[PDB]
Coordinates of C-alpha atoms and ligand atoms in Angstrom, one line a residue:
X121 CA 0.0 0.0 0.0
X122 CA 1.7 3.0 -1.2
X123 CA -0.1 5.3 0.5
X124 CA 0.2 4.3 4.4
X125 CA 2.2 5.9 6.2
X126 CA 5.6 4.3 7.4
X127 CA 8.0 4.9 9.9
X128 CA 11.5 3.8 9.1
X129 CA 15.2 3.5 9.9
X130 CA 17.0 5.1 6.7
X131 CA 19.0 1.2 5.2
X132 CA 21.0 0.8 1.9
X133 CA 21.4 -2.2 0.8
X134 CA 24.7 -2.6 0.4
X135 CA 28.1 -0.5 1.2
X136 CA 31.8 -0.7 0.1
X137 CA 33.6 -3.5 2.5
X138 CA 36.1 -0.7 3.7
X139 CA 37.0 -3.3 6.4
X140 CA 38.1 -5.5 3.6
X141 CA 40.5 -2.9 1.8
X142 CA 43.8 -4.0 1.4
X143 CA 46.1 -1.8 2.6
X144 CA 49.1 -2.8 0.3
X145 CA 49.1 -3.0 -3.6
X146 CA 51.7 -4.1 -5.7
X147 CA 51.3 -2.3 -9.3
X148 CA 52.1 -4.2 -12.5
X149 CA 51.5 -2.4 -15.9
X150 CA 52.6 -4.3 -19.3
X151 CA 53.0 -1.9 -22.1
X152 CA 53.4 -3.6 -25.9
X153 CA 53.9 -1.1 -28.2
X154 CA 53.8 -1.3 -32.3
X155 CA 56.3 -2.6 -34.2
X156 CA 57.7 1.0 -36.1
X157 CA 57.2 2.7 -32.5
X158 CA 59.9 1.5 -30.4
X159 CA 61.1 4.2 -27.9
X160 CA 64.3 4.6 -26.6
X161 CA 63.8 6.0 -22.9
X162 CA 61.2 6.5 -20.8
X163 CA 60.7 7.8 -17.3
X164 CA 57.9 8.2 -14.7
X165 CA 56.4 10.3 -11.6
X166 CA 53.1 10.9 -9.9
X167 CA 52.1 14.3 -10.7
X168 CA 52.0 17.2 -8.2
X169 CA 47.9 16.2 -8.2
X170 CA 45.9 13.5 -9.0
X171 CA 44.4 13.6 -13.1
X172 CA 46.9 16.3 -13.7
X173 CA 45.0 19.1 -12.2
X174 CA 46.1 22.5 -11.7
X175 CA 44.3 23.1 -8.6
X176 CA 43.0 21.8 -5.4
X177 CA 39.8 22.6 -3.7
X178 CA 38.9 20.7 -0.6
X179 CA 35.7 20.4 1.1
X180 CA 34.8 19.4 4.5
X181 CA 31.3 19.9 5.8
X182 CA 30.5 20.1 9.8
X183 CA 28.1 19.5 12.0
X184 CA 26.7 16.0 10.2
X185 CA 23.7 18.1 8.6
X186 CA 20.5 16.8 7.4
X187 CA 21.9 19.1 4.0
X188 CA 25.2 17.0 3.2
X189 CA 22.8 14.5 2.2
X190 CA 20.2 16.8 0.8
X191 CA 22.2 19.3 -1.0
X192 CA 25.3 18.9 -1.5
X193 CA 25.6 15.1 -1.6
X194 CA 22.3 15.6 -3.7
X195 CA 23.5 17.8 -6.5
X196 CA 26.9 16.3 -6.8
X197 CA 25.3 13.0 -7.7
X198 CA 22.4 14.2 -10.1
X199 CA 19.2 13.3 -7.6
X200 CA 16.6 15.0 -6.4
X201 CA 16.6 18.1 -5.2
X202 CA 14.3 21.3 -3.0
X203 CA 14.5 24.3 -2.8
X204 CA 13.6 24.3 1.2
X205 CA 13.2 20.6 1.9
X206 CA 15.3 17.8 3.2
X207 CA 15.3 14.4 1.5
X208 CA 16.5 11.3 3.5
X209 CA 17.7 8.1 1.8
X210 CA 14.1 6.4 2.0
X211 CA 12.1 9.2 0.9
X212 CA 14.5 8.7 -2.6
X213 CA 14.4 4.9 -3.3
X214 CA 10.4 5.3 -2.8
X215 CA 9.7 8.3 -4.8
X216 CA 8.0 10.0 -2.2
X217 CA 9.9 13.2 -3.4
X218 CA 8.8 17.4 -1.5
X219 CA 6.1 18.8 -3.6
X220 CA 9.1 21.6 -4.9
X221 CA 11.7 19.1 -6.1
X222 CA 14.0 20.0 -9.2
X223 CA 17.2 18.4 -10.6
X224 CA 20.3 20.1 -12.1
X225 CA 19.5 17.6 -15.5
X226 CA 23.6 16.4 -14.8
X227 CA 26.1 15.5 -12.2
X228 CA 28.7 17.6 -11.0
X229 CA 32.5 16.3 -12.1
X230 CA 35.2 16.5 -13.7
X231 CA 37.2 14.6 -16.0
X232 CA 40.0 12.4 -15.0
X233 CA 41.7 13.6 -18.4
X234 CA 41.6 10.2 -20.1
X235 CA 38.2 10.5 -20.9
X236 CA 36.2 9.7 -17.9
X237 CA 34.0 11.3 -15.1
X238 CA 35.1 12.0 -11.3
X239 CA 32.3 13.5 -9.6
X240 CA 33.0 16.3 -7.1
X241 CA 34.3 14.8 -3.7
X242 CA 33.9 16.2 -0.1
X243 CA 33.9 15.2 3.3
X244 CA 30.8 15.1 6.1
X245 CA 32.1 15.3 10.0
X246 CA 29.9 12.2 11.9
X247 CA 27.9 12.9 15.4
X248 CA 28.3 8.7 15.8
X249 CA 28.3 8.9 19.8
X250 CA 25.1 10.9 19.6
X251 CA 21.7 8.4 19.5
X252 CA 19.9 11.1 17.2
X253 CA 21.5 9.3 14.4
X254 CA 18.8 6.7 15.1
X255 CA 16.1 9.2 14.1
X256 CA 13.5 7.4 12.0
X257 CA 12.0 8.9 8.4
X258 CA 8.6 8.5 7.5
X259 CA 7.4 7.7 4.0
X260 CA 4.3 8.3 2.8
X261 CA 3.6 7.9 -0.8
X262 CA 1.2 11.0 -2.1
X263 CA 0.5 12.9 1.0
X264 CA 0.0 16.3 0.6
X265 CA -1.7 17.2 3.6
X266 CA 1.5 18.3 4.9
X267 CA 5.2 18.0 4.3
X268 CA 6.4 18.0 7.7
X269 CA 8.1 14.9 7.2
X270 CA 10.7 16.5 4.6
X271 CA 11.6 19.2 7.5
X272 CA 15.4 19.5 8.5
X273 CA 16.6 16.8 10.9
X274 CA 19.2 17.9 13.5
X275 CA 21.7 15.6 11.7
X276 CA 21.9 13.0 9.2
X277 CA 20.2 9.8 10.2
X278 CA 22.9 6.9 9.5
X279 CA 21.2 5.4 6.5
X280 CA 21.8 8.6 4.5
X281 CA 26.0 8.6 5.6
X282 CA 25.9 4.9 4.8
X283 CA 24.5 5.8 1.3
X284 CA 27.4 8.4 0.8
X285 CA 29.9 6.2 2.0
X286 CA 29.1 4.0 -1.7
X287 CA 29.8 7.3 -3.6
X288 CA 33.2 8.1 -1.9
X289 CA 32.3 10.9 0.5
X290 CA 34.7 11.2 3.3
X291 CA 34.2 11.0 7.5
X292 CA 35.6 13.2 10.3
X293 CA 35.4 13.3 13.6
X294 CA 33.9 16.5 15.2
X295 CA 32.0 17.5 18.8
X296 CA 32.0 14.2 20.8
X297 CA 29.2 13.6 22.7
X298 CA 30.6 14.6 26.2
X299 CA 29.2 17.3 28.7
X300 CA 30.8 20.2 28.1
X301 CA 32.5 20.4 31.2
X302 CA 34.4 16.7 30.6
X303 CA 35.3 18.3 26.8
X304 CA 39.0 17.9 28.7
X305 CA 42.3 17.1 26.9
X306 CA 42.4 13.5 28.6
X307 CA 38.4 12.5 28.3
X308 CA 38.3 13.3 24.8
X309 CA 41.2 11.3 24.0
X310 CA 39.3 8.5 25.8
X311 CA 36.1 9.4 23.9
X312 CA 37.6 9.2 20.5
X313 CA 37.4 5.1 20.5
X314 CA 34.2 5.2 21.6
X315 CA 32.6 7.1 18.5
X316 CA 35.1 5.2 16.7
X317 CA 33.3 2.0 17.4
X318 CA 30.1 3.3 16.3
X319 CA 31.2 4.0 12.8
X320 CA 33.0 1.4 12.2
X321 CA 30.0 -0.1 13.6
X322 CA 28.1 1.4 11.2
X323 CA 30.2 1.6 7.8
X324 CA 30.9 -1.3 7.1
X325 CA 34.0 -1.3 9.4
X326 CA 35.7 2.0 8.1
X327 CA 37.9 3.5 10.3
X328 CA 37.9 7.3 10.9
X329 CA 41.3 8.9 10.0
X330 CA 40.5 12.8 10.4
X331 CA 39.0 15.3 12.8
X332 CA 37.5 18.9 11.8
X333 CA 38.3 21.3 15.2
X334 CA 35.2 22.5 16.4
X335 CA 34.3 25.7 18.0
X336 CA 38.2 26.8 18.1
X337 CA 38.5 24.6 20.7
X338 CA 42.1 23.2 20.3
X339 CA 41.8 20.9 23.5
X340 CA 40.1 18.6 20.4
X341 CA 43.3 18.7 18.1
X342 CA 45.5 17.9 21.7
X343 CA 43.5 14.9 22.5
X344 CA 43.5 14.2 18.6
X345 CA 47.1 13.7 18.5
X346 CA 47.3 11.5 20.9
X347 CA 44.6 8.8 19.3
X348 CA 46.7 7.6 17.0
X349 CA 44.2 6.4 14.5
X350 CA 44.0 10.5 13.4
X351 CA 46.2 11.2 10.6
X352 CA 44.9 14.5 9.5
X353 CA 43.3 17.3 10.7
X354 CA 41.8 20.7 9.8
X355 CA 41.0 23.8 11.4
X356 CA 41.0 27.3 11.0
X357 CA 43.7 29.2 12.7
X358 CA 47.0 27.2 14.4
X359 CA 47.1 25.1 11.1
X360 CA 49.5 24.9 8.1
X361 CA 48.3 26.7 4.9
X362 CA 48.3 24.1 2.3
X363 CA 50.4 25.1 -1.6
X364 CA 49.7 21.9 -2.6
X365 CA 53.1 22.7 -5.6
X366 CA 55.5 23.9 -2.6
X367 CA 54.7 21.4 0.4
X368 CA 57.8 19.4 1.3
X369 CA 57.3 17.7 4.3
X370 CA 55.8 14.8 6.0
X371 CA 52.1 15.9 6.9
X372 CA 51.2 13.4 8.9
X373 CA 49.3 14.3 12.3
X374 CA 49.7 18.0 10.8
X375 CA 46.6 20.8 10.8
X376 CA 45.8 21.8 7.6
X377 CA 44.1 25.4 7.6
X378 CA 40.6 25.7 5.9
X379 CA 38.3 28.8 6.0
X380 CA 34.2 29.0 6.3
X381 CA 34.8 32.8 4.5
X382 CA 32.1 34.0 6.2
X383 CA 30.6 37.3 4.6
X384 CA 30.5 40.8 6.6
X385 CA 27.9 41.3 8.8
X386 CA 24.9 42.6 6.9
X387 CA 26.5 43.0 3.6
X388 CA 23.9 40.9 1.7
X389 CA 26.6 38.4 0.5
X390 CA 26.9 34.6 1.0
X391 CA 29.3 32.4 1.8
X392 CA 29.5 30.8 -1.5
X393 CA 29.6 34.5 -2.9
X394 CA 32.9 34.9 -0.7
X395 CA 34.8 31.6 -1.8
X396 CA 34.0 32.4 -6.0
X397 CA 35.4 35.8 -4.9
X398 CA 38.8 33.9 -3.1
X399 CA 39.2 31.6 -5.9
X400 CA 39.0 34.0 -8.8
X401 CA 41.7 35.9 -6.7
X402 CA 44.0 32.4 -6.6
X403 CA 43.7 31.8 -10.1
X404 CA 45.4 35.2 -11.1
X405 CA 48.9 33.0 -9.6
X406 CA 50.8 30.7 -11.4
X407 CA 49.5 27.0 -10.7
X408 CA 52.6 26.4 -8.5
X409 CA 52.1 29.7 -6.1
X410 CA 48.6 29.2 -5.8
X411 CA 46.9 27.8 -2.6
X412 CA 44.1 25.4 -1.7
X413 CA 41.0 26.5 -1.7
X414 CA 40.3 24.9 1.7
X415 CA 36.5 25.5 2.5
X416 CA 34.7 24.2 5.3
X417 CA 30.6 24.7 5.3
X418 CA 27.7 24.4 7.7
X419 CA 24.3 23.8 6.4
X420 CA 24.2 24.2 2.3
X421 CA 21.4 25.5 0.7
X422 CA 19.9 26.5 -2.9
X423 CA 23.1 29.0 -3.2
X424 CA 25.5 26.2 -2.6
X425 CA 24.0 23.9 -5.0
X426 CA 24.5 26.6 -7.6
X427 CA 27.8 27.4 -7.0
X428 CA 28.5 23.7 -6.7
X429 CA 27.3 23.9 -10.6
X430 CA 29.2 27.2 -11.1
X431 CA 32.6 25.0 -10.3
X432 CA 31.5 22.5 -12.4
X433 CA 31.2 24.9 -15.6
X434 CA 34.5 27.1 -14.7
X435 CA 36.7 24.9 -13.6
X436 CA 34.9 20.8 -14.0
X437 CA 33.5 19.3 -16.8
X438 CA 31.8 21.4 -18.2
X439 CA 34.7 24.2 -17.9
X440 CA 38.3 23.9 -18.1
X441 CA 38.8 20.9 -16.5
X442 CA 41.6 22.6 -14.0
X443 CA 40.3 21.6 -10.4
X444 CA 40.3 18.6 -8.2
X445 CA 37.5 18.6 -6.0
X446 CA 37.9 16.3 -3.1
X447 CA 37.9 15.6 0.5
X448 CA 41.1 16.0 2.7
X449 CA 40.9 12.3 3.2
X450 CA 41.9 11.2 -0.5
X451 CA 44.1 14.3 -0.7
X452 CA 46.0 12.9 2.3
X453 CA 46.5 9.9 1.0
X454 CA 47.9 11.0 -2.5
X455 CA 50.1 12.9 -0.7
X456 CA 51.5 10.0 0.5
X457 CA 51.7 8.0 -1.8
X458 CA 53.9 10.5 -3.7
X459 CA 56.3 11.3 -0.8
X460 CA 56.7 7.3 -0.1
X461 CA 55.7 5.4 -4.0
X462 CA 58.6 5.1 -6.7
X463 CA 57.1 4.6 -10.4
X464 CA 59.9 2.7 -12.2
X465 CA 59.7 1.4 -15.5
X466 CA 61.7 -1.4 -17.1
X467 CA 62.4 -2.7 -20.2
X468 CA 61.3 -6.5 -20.8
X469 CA 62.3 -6.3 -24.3
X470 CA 63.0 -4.7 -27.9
X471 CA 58.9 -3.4 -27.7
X472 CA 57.9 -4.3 -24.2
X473 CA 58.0 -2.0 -20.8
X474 CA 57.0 -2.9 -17.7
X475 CA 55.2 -0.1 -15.1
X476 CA 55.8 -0.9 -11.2
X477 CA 54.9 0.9 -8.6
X478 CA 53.9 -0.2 -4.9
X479 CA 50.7 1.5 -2.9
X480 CA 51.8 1.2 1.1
X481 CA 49.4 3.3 3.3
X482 CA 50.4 3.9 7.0
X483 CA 49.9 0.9 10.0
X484 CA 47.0 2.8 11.3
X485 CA 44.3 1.3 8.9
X486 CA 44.0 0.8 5.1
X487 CA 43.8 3.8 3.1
X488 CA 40.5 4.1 1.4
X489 CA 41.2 5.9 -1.7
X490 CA 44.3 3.6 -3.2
X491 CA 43.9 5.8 -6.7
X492 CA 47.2 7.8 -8.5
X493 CA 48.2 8.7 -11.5
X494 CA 51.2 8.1 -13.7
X495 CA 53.1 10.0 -15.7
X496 CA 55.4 8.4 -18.4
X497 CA 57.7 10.7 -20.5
X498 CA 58.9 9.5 -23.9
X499 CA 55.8 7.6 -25.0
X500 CA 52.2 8.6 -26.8
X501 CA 49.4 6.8 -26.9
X502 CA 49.9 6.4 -31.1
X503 CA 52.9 4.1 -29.9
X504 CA 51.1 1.7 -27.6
X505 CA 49.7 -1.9 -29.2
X506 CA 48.3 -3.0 -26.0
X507 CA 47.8 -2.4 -22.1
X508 CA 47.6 -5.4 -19.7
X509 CA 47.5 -5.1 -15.9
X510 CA 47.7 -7.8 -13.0
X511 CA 45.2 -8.0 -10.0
X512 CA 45.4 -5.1 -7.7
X513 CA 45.0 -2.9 -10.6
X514 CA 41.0 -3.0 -10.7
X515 CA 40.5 0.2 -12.7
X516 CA 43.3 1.7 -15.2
X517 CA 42.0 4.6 -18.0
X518 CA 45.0 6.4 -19.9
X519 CA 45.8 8.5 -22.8
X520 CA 47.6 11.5 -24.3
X521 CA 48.3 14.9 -21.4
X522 CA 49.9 17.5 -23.0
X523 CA 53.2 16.1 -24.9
X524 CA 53.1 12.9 -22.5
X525 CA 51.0 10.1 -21.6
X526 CA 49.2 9.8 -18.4
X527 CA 47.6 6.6 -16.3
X528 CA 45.0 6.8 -14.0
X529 CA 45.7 3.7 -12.2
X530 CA 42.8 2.4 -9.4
X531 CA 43.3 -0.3 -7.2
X532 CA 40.4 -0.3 -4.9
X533 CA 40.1 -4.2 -4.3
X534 CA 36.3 -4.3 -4.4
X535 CA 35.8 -1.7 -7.0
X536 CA 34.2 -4.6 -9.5
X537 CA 32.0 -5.9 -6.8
X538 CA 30.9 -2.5 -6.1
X539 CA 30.1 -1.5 -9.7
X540 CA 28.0 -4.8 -10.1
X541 CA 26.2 -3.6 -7.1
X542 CA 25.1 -0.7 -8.5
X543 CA 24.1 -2.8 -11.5
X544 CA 21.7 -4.8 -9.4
X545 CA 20.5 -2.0 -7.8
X546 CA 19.7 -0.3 -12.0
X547 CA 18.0 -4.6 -12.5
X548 CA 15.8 -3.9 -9.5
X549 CA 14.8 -0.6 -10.7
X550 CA 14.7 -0.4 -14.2
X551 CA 12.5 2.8 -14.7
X552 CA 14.9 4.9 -12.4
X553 CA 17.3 7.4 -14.6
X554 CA 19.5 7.9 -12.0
X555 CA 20.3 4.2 -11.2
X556 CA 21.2 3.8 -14.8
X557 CA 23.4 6.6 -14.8
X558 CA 25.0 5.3 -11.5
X559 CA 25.6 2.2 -12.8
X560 CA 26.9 3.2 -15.9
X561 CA 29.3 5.6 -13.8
X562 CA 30.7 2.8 -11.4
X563 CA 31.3 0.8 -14.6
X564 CA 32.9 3.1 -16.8
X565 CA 35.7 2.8 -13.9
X566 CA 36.5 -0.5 -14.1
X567 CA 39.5 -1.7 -16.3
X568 CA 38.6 -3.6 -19.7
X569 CA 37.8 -7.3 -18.4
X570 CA 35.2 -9.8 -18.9
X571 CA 33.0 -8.6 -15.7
X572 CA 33.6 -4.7 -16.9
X573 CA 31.8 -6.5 -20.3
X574 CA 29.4 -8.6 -18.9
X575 CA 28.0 -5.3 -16.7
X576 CA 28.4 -3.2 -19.6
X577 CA 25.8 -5.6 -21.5
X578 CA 23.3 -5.6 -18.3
X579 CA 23.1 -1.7 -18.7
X580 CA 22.4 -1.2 -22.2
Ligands
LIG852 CU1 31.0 22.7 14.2

């Protein structure tokens, strides 16, 4: 009966086995080329950032709002959106959409620069020690008496993080459920495991790597360093301003600096108006003096969503392609992997080389983003006869980048798995644009194989 109403706890039906993740991948590439191309010499690095970008722009969004889901995961991913309502994960998979909803017509991306889509990245902070996570949502199929139901939640219920978690979005930790007069140095660090627990609890055994500082209050970041699980951190004064082109040093357990550039009091402007202002200022620099844009947000709203679109026709897809636009997490992670990873490349014979490179994240837990890219100077994509990879590679896209050739190279072990999942989830409903265009996205990442063939067939 479609049109009872129903009470529920926000579920997906399946999430990435972050538990699972191996944190150690041993990169093989085989590159035949043709037979009037031999090359002479070639050499390799892992660009300053991932895809060959010009510029970062990191996102981390606070207080675990009902609107990370709503908005901003929302318009990244090409759902539904409202103008002043608040969608939860059940109220999409049953079509019982706010009586105002809208959608952009496209996702929000941008290339990888061999020809595929990375949609826009960011991270969520998680209120996991606090029980209002377990707020129900109630569905009700074409009621319009009211709309109460689509009304702003204090936070995100879990189902609607566990739904973003499949799509890459990043965790941190923020406020921990303590009173305010145990928010101590020593009973934070204590209270750090606890929430902890929960999400791992909760997704799929992920382990929380980061903490946003709340409130200025840098007992948070003392206790932080001390739980070792942290590896990175953000905050908005007694942080490191990131140049992502100059930064030399090890950045583990460091503070990265990221501003809410909040507008003068009364001046009519918006956040969002702010940051366009602060980027158009940073892209006046050379790519190599320019900064992060390193944005933190609270709730996001119709403005965001539009300026979310606005990056995405300046400077994504739709533009010129310059930006990454990801969560501190991944960024982190890249980071290290070009500090601590050596690209080599060997010669097997007269028209064979061979691409090595090994993907180590730290003892903490496994990294969760186990993606790079490889630059290889001396060879085109005209020369090359064929491509073949071994296991850990599970998604590999490559091609021509200015006068060199570039490899995006993604070893996420259950990357296939996941893909097919979103293929089931497309077979079970069939009439649902969106679910065909998620599937077709997951796909389009694997590397050429019989599954990436068989799922390309289920999707037609
Ligand atoms: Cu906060």
């Amino acid at each position: 009966d479609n049109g009872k109403r129903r009470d529920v706890i926000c579920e997906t039906e399946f999430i990435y086995p972050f538990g699972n993740e191996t944190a150690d991948k041993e990169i093989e590439i085989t590159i035949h080329l043709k037979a009037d191309r031999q090359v002479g010499y070639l050499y390799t690095e892992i660009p300053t950032l991932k895809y060959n970008k010009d510029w970062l722009f990191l996102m981390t969004q606070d207080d675990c709002m009902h609107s990370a889901f709503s908005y901003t995961w929302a318009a990244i991913h090409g759902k539904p959106l409202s103008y002043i309502y608040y969608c939860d994960l059940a109220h999409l998979q049953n079509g019982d959409l706010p009586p105002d909803y809208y959608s952009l017509g496209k996702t929000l991306a941008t290339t990888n620069g061999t020809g595929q889509e990375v949609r826009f990245s960011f991270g969520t902070t998680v209120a996991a020690d606090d029980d209002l996570m377990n707020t129900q949502t109630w569905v009700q199929n074409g009621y319009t008496r009211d709309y109460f139901r689509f009304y702003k939640k204090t936070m995100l219920v879990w189902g609607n993080l566990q739904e973003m978690m499949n799509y890459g979005v990043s965790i941190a930790f923020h406020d921990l459920n303590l009173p305010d007069e145990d928010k101590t140095e020593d009973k934070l660090l204590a209270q750090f495991p606890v929430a902890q627990s929960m999400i791992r609890e909760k997704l799929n055994n992920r382990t929380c790597k980061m903490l946003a500082e709340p409130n200025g209050d840098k007992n948070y970041i003392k206790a932080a360093l001390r739980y070792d699980k942290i590896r990175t951190l953000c905050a908005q004064s007694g942080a490191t301003k990131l140049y992502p082109f100059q930064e030399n040093g090890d950045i583990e357990q460091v503070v990265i600096e990221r501003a809410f550039y909040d507008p003068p009091e009364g001046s009519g402007l918006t956040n969002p108006d702010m940051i366009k202002a602060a980027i158009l200022k940073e892209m006046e620099n050379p790519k190599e003096e320019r900064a992060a844009i390193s944005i933190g947000a609270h709730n996001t709203d119709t403005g965001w969503v539009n300026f979310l679109e606005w990056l995405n026709d300046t400077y994504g897809r739709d533009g010129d392609d310059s930006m990454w636009f990801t969560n501190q997490e991944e960024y982190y992670e890249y980071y290290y992997y070009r500090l601590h990873s050596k690209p080599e490349i060997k010669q097997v014979n007269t028209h064979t080389w061979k691409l090595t490179l090994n993907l180590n994240g730290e003892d903490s837990a496994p990294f969760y983003y186990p993606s790079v890219t490889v630059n290889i100077f001396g060879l085109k994509m005209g020369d090359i006869e064929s491509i073949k990879s071994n296991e850990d590679v599970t998604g590999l896209s490559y091609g021509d980048h200015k006068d060199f050739f570039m490899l995006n190279i993604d070893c996420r072990k259950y990357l296939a798995e996941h893909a097919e999942n979103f293929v089931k989830r497309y077979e079970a409903n069939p009439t649902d644009v969106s679910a065909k265009a998620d599937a077709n996205y997951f796909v389009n990442m694997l590397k050429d194989s019989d599954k990436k063939t068989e799922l390309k067939k289920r999707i037609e």
